[PDB]
Amino acid sequence: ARFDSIGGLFEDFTQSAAQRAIEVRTIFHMIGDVSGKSVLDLACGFGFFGREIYRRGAAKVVGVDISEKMIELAREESRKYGDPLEFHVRDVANMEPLGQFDLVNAAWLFNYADSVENLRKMFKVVRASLKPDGKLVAYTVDPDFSLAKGNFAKYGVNVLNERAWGPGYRHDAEFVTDPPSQFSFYRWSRADYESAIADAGFSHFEWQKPLLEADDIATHPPGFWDVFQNNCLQTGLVCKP
Ligand SMILES: Nc1ncnc2c1ncn2[C@@H]1O[C@H](CSCC[C@H](N)C(=O)O)[C@@H](O)[C@H]1O
Predict the structure, then answer these.
(1) Sign, Cα dihedral of 185, 191, 192, 197
(2) Ligand 1 centroid vs 204 CA: distance in angstroms?
């Protein structure tokens, strides 16, 4: 698993990258009230979103990640903070269902599907993980990002290259950490996402813009966020059966 070589550097990135506050705000905006809900946190990393969802009153939280090292970090954080989260090592594209939840949170899952067939498999796994009145909240790569229109290094992600891959694109990148931490991701088109969503059985969905706010703009020089707004690497997505 790629993040077996990243480990704690990902949390370092979340503490230093300018984009992180925006993605975190956007995801919790999409989630809304979690009181009493059962929650499945996919591509959970060290568990950030599932853990904070628990802190905000969810009834039961389960996290899944492909990286054994990241899950060992997640488990240690749950010990450190005395919380009841449970974790599993799985490739979400190939995993058995672990139950039907009120909410699936997938922050940076689908941009790691390494083929359009695996993108479609992941959406089907998510649908199988939801109650009929549940919802998927996802955060992924914006299909319209183009490397030539501006890199994201100033916001925490140095995108190194861009190459056709299947019906989409693949990108090598690094988180801007000390030292930088390399990873790869996949940029699937809006049409392929919407097809995967519908074919998995989600009859409702919407793309959600990143919630850049006035105070973000005020605390940087004018124009700092222009590449973020004109060539955004990220987007939210909410889907409902
Ligand atoms: N196919 C797959 N199935 C499950 N997890 C995956 C995956 N491909 C990548 N990942 C995991 O996705 C994570 C992306 S980093 C994001 C972590 C967390 N959602 C957060 O935002 O804080 C990594 O921990 C990586 O190991």
Answers:
(1) positive
(2) 25
